[model samples]
Target: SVTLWQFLLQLLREQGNGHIISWTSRDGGEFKLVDAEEVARLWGLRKNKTNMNYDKLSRALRYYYDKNIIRKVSGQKFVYKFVSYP
Candidate 1:
């Protein structure tokens, strides 16, 4: 978890220096990223802590694998993908 934060901060700094920030979403959504607060509110998560920020919320999603909520799928490098067939 600490490592992920360090790496994310490093990547942000490096990209910021080069002004090479990403302009699109991996999900190809009109919006670049979903706000964690919006999701929590949608799920009726009332006891959410003050410190339960986006990063920590994301880490919690990672815990889904351990809880068997989902199984990793192949050829899916990200949470979203391109589809050729409907």
Candidate 2:
């Protein structure tokens, strides 16, 4: 059970990921999407939707903005500085 939001937390750990997702070190929540389409495709599989593209997936990401959940642009792609905390 994951959405575009929680999935971010999914890859925070280098525990099971291949090389698709990774953090910019323990550099205060800096993270990225190396294979966006692949990530979206996986999420699509989990959500049972074949129509999930980075476009729709990205719009889904916009919600993070409204909630102050993230940012970190300036040449970065699908980037977010979500220094996650509980």
Candidate 3:
């Protein structure tokens, strides 16, 4: 299982490991990024109030969005998915 930090670090690889993986997945199947809150809930990362909030996570996502690393699938909604190069 890949942790979020590991995943992000993979994305930061100089040779573009993350891009290659994402491209392969999208070209081969419908791979996508689910909402952070959904992911946290699924992974049991947000079982308490001290855990991160979805809105703050979404803001970080917006930064990535601005960098074109992710494209928004839902407008003005807490629920969203990301798209990557196919």
Which segments of model 1 are wrong by more than 4 Å? 1-33, 40-45, 71-86
lDDT by residue for model 2 over 19-86, one digit each (tens)?
Answer: 66677645567677778787778778777877677777677777677777765544877666774551
Residues 29-68, model 1: lDDT tens digits: 2111134344334233334334445455456546655654
Candidate 1 has what TM-score? 0.32
Between prediction 1 and prediction 3, which has the larger lDDT? 3
Residue 58 displacement (Å), model 3? 0.6
Lowest lDDT 10-residue stretch of candidate 1: 77-86
Candidate 3 lDDT over 1-86, as tens digits, reads 74432343343333534322232233432223334455434333533435664565556657766665654554434333334532
TM-score: which candidate is best?
Answer: 2
The candidate with the higher lDDT, 2 or 3, is 2
What clash pairs does model 2 have? none
- Candidates sorted by TM-score, descending order? 2, 3, 1
